[PDB]
């Protein structure tokens, strides 16, 4: 019922099999277009089929409290050929947002979301933002024992893998670059189960030069085939546009 190529032919030019459970990951520093990419994916997924959409529902989980409905509405109205309030209402009728305040809160939200997931059959995409939102607090609360710094993340990863395997969903996660290492910059620090659960990896970067910005770099790295690709794209009032 779900096809990965249709979601994004630009980035997913190799994956053509009907997706029946995948885990992806975004990574990079601040202000490099991760949330804009998520907005573009949601816009591609929730638009009507007449305007070039997918007509399936999206679930969103916000952890860093950085979601902006105004930007999403602006992108939707710019992508639409004709702007009308009722069509925007129809589009937004298939969008859901959840807030979590702590690791246990997120764990219980995951333990509760399966009721909706069995209730709603049209869900095809799942987004978790800022998976590394609670790292320092958990680490400090865990003392010097590593196993006490990893339990909540372990349980959340197990629940996420169970959900994605059971309900045939697509997961999009975001992490933050917090620590360096004594061309890809990546110093893994997450849970071992989460690290081994990843399938695709994408890194984000921004041009240092001030050519009015308008240039972002993305490096796609799939662990299945060890294929490294570089993408260039721009972000405008209508969303993101690939160079």
């Amino acid at each position: 019922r779900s096809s990965l190529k249709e979601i994004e032919p630009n980035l997913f030019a190799d994956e053509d099999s009907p997706v029946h459970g995948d885990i992806l990951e975004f990574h990079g520093p601040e202000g490099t277009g991760k949330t804009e990419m998520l907005y573009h994916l949601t816009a591609r997924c929730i638009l009507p089929k007449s305007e070039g959409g997918l007509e399936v529902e999206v679930l969103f989980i916000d952890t860093d409290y950085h979601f902006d409905m105004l930007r999403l509405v602006t992108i939707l109205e710019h992508r639409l050929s004709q702007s009308s309030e009722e069509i925007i209402k129809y589009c937004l009728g298939r969008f859901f947002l959840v807030y979590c305040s702590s690791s246990t809160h997120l764990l219980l939200t995951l333990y509760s979301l399966e009721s909706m997931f069995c209730s709603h059959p049209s869900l095809c995409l799942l987004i978790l933002d800022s998976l590394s939102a609670f790292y320092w607090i958990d680490r400090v609360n865990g003392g010097e024992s590593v196993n006490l710094q990893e339990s909540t993340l372990r349980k959340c990863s197990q629940c996420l893998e169970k959900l994605v395997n059971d309900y045939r969903l697509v997961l999009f996660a975001t992490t933050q670059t917090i620590m360096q290492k004594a061309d890809i910059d990546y110093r893994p620090y997450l849970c071992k189960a989460w690290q081994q659960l990843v399938k695709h990896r994408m890194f984000f970067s921004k041009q240092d030069d001030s050519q009015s910005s308008n240039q972002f770099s993305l490096v796609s790295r799939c662990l299945k085939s060890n294929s490294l690709k570089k993408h260039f794209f721009i972000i405008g009032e209508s969303g993101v546009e690939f160079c």
Binding site: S102, T104, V140, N141, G142, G143, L148
Partner: protein, 325 residues
């Protein structure tokens, strides 16, 4: 409504024990017997009592009351009319003030003049308080203070004679040299550890002596600029000291005066004088003054202030002390 344990000042061991036990919110332990808490967690009963006391430890003032308090509290005059005019009336209370300058420019003279002036009776527009002087360089000479106090006494006597009142005479009855000298408290710190120890002991001393209105630390650059190669430790100590000093000034309604030194910044094959101790130290103080020579005159520049505007004035040092023109 929920308060997390991480926000409370607890030791890491007891906190991690509580976290591993299963306690996550502050209110969760407000209904647990200390004996049962010690039994389940495994801590001692003294630890349970201490943490229960600590957790139950964490008014309403508007800008109008703050303005009234600011108007009621006066300023400390420097006997330099231009400096007072550009400062807004004088050195303000509840604020941290910093003075920078090249050697032999007049920072210590200003410190002594402020220490003398903080005791002017309120009938003449003063504050009528006492001063605490902390010396880290050994440059405090009593004879200079005696000269300054005698000059101030003569000035006030002349003003009172010109006015020809009755309140002024009564106020000047007790404004003698002995009282002025006895209302200045002196400390000598020969190392930065000693300076930190004295600053730590300061709050109890101020609690005992509630009439103090000025705290002077003549020299913070010298203790921190020698035999200290770990600069991160220096920055941490300086930030802690600045926070402690501003807290003291706000809590005890004082005026804090700090004196800094000048260093040379070498760029584009040009040499400019800048305050020492780095860039992050510039945020520590509330008001920053810079003293320098132009040709032969001495200039005071209000480099930074959150209430006034940048300016520049002229002053000079006389046998009577800090003066103008």
């Amino acid at each position: 409504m929920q308060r997390d344990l991480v926000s409370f000042p607890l030791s890491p061991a007891v906190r991690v024990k509580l976290v591993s036990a299963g306690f996550q919110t502050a209110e969760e332990l407000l209904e647990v017997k200390p004996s049962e808490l010690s039994k389940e967690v495994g801590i001692s009963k003294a630890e349970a009592l201490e943490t229960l006391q600590i957790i139950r430890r964490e008014k309403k003032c508007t800008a109008l009351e703050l303005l009234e308090q600011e108007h009621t509290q006066g300023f400390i005059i420097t006997f330099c009319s231009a400096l007072d005019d550009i400062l807004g009336g004088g050195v303000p209370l509840m604020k941290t003030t910093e003075i920078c300058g090249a050697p032999g420019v007049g920072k210590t003279q200003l410190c002594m003049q402020l220490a003398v002036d903080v005791q002017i009776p309120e009938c003449f527009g003063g504050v009528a308080g006492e001063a605490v002087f902390i010396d880290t360089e050994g440059s405090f000479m009593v004879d200079r203070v005696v000269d300054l106090a005698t000059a101030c006494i003569q000035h006030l006597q002349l003003i009172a004679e010109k006015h020809k009142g009755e309140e002024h005479r009564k106020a000047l009855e007790d404004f003698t040299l002995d009282n002025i000298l006895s209302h200045i408290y002196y400390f000598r710190c020969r190392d930065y550890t000693e300076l930190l120890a004295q600053v730590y002991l300061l709050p109890d001393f101020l609690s005992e002596h509630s009439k103090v209105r000025l705290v002077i630390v003549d020299g913070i650059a010298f203790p921190f600029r020698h035999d200290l190669d770990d600069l991160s430790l220096r920055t941490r100590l300086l930030n802690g000291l600045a926070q402690q000093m501003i807290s003291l000034a706000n809590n005890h309604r004082l005026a804090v005066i700090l004196t800094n030194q000048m260093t040379t910044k070498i760029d584009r094959n040009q040499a400019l004088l800048v305050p020492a101790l780095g860039e992050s130290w510039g945020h520590a103080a509330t008001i920053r003054l810079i003293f320098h020579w132009d040709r032969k005159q001495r200039l005071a520049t209000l480099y930074k202030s959150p209430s006034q505007k940048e300016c520049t004035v002229l002053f000079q040092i006389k046998p009577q002390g800090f003066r103008d023109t």
